[PDB]
Design a protein around this nucleic acid. Structure first.
Ligand SMILES: [Mg+2]
Ligand SMILES: [Mg+2]
Ligand SMILES: [Mg+2]
Ligand SMILES: [Mg+2]
Ligand SMILES: [Mg+2]
Ligand SMILES: [Mg+2]
Ligand SMILES: [Mg+2]
Ligand SMILES: [Mg+2]
Ligand SMILES: [Mg+2]
Ligand SMILES: [Mg+2]
Ligand SMILES: [Mg+2]
Ligand SMILES: [Mg+2]
Ligand SMILES: [Mg+2]
Ligand SMILES: [Mg+2]
Ligand SMILES: [Mg+2]
Ligand SMILES: [Mg+2]
Ligand SMILES: [Mg+2]
Ligand SMILES: [Mg+2]
Ligand SMILES: [Mg+2]
Ligand SMILES: [Mg+2]
Ligand SMILES: [Mg+2]
Ligand SMILES: [Mg+2]
Ligand SMILES: [Mg+2]
Ligand SMILES: [Mg+2]
Lengths: 51, 52, 102, 134
RNA sequence: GAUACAUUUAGGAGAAUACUACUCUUUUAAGCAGAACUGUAAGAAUGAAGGUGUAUGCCGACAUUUUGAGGUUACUGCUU
RNA sequence: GAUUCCUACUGUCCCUACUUACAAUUUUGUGAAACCACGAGACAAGGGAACGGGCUUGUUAUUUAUCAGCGGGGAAAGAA
RNA sequence: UUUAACCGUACCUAUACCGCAUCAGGUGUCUUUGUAUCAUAACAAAUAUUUUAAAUUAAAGUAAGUAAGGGAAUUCGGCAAAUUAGAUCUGUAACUUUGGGAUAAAGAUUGGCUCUAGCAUGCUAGAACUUUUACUAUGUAAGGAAUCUGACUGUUUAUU
RNA sequence: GAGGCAGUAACAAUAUAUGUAUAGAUAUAGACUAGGGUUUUCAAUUUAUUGAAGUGAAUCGGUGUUAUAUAAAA
């Protein structure tokens, strides 16, 4: 809400980084040919609980 | 058809609402290539984008 | 190729419809009225200055009469097919005017 | 709701009887009624004259009958109300009953011919133009 | 059940209608006239209890005449 | 706050009638739930766990397989 | 003057919060133009969103209107609806804890235009002319006579 | 895991022969805090998916004093 402490910003930056699909350079490998990410979240559905 | 980008940017330059801007259907070609604030200020002086 | 001029009153056509939609109904009843006279069943199209005059009072009210002219033109999809266009004609007093053929 | 009947039947018998009132269609039925008196028989083109008037006039009122027009043929005039709307077939037949009661004669003074559309005040068209004076 | 006939549609209108069904069919809709409802149109002229002051000039609610006028056809009939 | 009587007022009533909008009736799109021993047509009397849809003697429906209403019965559905 | 360190500065105010949801519910503070002779109510500015079935015809519903003659005979009960109402001038009872009761009750007046008269200069009295007669679009107390109980202003079973 | 009832109840459905316009219709609008955390902006492909870019303080908030042995973003 444009008035954050130090801890709230450092935790919020790391939680943005982990919400991403698999990159395209890895998907061409035989290991990850059809595998896809399952731990994605939506910003309107589920809340992050940071306060 | 980049009509929505022209309506929103030209509202900021004149400090006016979106409903007052009148585009010109004759100069249809020039509006599809706008990307800067500078190109709009020449379009107002050529009366292609006028105020109501 | 001949042109027509008819007087059509919309107070007779839209008598007893719901007044919440009186202008919008007066267009659909206007289309079926000319399919009754002209036996041909191609299509009926309306010029923009005629459409603006019907909506001049609003949805609830409709002006009494209107003077029109009707011609047959070519289509915008196929060249060999046809369509019928209607247009507005300005006139002040409607007394004594008869339907003529141009 | 209000416009309904409250109770339909009792517990026993556990069906709905045919004598109760139930909603359905109405109209376009067939009826038959008796004892309508005949007053006058004539033709429509002719003028009817009585004794108690000085003027003579046709049977069709001013502006014609509503939804009908004019009469150009023979006609009959009888007393009372008759089944159905205008312009529909009506069958006439003789009476079944006998020993009808004798009454007296029929003396008709005048027949009305005013317009039946609005409140009409004039009998013939000459009374209308003599009033306004053209 | 008897006696005749058949393997019998499309589009509009209403006296018929919840959707079906029904009764009829080749003329659609303008404009006049007959018959009605409202109650005297706009414009123009002449007046007006007065008021200003000079320009025979401005500002005035309302009244009379043109006017039983003007407007409309969920009734009949003509004409192109 | 609880109770009775005068005046005015009125569709509360005698006794109901007419007009409009929104849902409903007709079309397209998205598209559920309660409930279900078997239900394949419905009744009169009998006996029976002393009030049968089915058992025993009698009387009876049927439009090419519908559509819209209604609340008599299923001792109707909810809650050991 | 290579003097003034460390952290936050995007965006949403309700279809970017909480009620399992793109939920007719709930949520701290401030600002906001014009007509409006007490105000209120209402309308217009400003700003933001938005695309295509049929219809003079059902019954029974949820809302809003009108009714000849009678006026509570309907009903446990005038439950629901109707009547009164603004402003100016006269006028005001029994009772009383002497303050009240009282805006008691009961009557009369109200437009438009042209002037006259006061001084405080935009407010108030009076006069003449005229009409299908004047708070009423919106807002706006039915009244009186008695009995039982609680002194009064106040509070309470969030959901019978 | 899949039936009947059933495509049934219940909800959504503005005009133009040529339009980046001419009209209609409903809703007062805009800023600080609590809560949300990339929803911001642009490009490409169809209120979606992927990828880049974007937050600059000596004087705007916190960091300071205390409310009679841990208290203020008004
Ligand atoms: Mg916060
Ligand atoms: Mg109607
Ligand atoms: Mg039949
Ligand atoms: Mg509807
Ligand atoms: Mg039995
Ligand atoms: Mg027995
Ligand atoms: Mg059924
Ligand atoms: Mg038990
Ligand atoms: Mg900033
Ligand atoms: Mg900001
Ligand atoms: Mg808030
Ligand atoms: Mg939420
Ligand atoms: Mg909400
Ligand atoms: Mg209807
Ligand atoms: Mg009455
Ligand atoms: Mg009366
Ligand atoms: Mg009584
Ligand atoms: Mg009684
Ligand atoms: Mg009451
Ligand atoms: Mg006076
Ligand atoms: Mg008390
Ligand atoms: Mg309670
Ligand atoms: Mg709906
Ligand atoms: Mg994005």
């Amino acid at each position: 809400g444009s008035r954050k402490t130090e801890i709230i910003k450092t935790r919020l930056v790391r939680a943005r980084r982990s919400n991403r699909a698999i990159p395209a350079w890895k998907s061409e490998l035989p290991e990850f040919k059809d595998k896809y990410n399952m731990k994605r979240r939506h910003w309107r559905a589920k809340k992050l609980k940071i306060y | 058809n980049k009509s929505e980008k022209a309506r929103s940017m030209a509202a900021k330059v004149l400090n006016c609402g979106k409903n007052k801007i009148w585009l010109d259907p004759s100069g249809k070609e020039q509006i599809n290539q706008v990307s800067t604030r500078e190109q709009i200020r020449q379009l107002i002086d050529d009366n292609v984008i006028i105020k109501k | 190729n001949k042109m027509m001029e008819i007087t059509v009153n919309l107070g007779k056509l839209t008598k007893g419809c719901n007044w919440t939609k009186k202008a919008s109904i007066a267009i659909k009843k206007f289309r079926s009225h000319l399919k009754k006279m002209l036996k041909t069943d191609e299509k009926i199209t309306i010029q923009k200055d005629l459409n603006k005059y019907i909506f001049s009072k609003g949805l609830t009210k409709v002006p009494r009469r209107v003077r029109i002219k009707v011609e047959r033109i070519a289509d915008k999809d196929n060249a060999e097919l046809n369509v019928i266009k209607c247009s507005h004609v300005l006139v002040g007093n409607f007394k004594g005017l008869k339907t003529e053929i141009i | 709701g209000i416009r309904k009947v409250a109770c339909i039947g009792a517990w026993h018998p556990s069906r709905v009887m045919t004598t109760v009132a139930r909603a359905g269609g109405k109209g376009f039925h067939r009826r038959t009624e008796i004892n309508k008196k005949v007053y006058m028989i004539g033709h429509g083109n002719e003028k009817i004259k009585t004794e108690y008037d000085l003027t003579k006039k046709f049977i069709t009122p001013m502006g014609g009958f509503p939804h009908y027009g004019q009469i150009k043929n023979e006609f009959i005039m009888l007393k009372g109300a008759i089944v159905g709307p205008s312009k529909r077939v009506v069958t006439l037949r003789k009476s079944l009953l006998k020993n009808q009661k004798k009454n007296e004669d029929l003396v008709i003074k005048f027949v009305d011919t005013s317009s039946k559309i609005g409140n009409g005040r004039f009998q013939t068209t000459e009374e209308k133009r003599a009033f306004y004076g053209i």
